[PDB]
Amino acid sequence: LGNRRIRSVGEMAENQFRVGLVRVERAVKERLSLGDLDNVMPQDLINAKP
DNA sequence: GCCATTTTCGCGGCTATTTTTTTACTCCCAAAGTTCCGCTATCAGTTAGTAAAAT
Known part of the structure; x- marks a missing residue:
């Protein structure tokens, strides 16, 4: 578990x-x-649709 | 020219039941074919009337 990471809603939304x-x-x-x-x-x- | 090594190719259980997705973008004009409303005109069907027949 030191080599596996938790990725939550904030990280995915930011990506x-x-x-x-x-x-x-x-x-x-x-x-x-x-x-x-x-x-x-x-x-x-700026086109916000993408 | 055969012996081994690397590269593709195809595969990985069966029945059910819950639920759509999402970027990116010129304009104008002349020429041509098509449609939509209106009118006409003919034919066939329907209906009203009247004479013919029967009680």
Whole structure:
């Protein structure tokens, strides 16, 4: 039991939330690479559906 | 060219009963085929009326 670990609700929720964050980070980087950001606000960059 | 070693391939019990999942995204225009409402017109069925027949 020193080589086996307990992983509970908080850890799993954090892992899946980080997965979603990576999913949106890819698209955020892709958009920020374009350059035309004069009228771009942060809420126009983030898609919460993933 | 045969003897051994590494790599795929296929397998791992039977009946029941509780319950769906989830990202990602241009626009416009001209040309063409299809549909939906309205009207017509014909035929067949139904129904009302009247004469023919029978009591």
